[model samples]
Target: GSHMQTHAARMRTFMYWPSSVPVQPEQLASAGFYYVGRNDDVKCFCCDGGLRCWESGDDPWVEHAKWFPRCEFLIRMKGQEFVDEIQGRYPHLLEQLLSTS
Candidate 1:
């Protein structure tokens, strides 16, 4: 089996700026998100929730969190419940981390 915490560490956290994001469509698929069409939008294969204008970013993690906060992928990787457990034992630097994208 894999470790969720370790996987969460490698997750994206910000949306790609329209002019400059460094992500590929295939990567989203690996993360459980998929390309929808011409625009930079992607839909969660599991949640069926859609997000766009950021198919490419340094931290697509936040995109998923911001748009589709209820996503299973987000939960599996960095769910509030998981964060709660970690944050409960460790003091937080911030209550939440959101993307500016």
Candidate 2:
């Protein structure tokens, strides 16, 4: 598990850049957005490993997730932010470490 935060800036906010942002299945489509899932569409960091889209099983676009890119984005937010999102989202998970890619 690589533990390195690649960047330290505004994380696209997911609201303004709704198209290629969110990193979540729930944030894509339905916003009148469309894109060509060409050969180079794969992303290794695909939603913490594509678990979100796997459950939905809808939209042909989502199928491209099967081919995650060879490279993945390093840790986005960790140490502090990591604990905050986890404890706030999955308090029962009882995570104690800030996991890296």
Candidate 3:
């Protein structure tokens, strides 16, 4: 129940949200994760998944995709069909397919 709060509410009190992280607290909440205030540790409220070591140039979506591949919230936010399509297709082949067009 506590995790269901609005994104703004969640972000306002996130102490570990650092300007150096290149990601906003709201971005984490928007992606269904909550700050745990320890070395970039955050948990996905939806899937109860945890992650840390956020780096520059890290896209939240991609990181979330990499770590919490089965998160329902990720799927709901990203769309199951879209995820399936990305997972199902070959990236280089898709690039080549598009390039030859």
The best candidate in terms of TM-score: 3
Better of 1 and 2 by lDDT: 1
What TM-score goes with each of the models? Answer: 0.39, 0.22, 0.51
lDDT of 3 at 94: 22
Score residue 83 of candidate 2 by CA lDDT: 35
What does candidate 3's lDDT look like per residue over 6-79, in tens digits?
55545533546455445655676565544422123565555545465566766565556555536655667474
Q: Candidate 2's error at 52, in angstroms?
A: 2.5
Each prediction's total of clashing residue pairs, residues at least 3 apart in sequence or on different chains, is 4, 2, 0
1-101 per-residue lDDT for model 2 (tens digits): 33221242112222322244334434333211122111122222323432223344344223323322211231333324543454475545433455755
Tell me how many residue pairs clash in candidate 3. 0
The true-versus-predicted C-alpha distance at residue 40 of model 2, in Å, is 12
> Residue-wise lDDT of candidate 1 within 1-101, one digit each (tens)?
23322433223322333554456645554454433211234455444464654543344554544455355655675666644564465464244666855
Once fitted onto the true fold, the runs of candidate 2 whose alpha carbons sit more than 4 angstroms away are 1-43, 46-48, 54-74, 78-83, 94-101
Rank order by lDDT, top first? 3, 1, 2
Can you list the residue pairs that collide in candidate 3?
none
- On the 0 to 100 scale, the lDDT of residue 48 in model 1 is 40
lDDT of each: 0.46, 0.30, 0.52
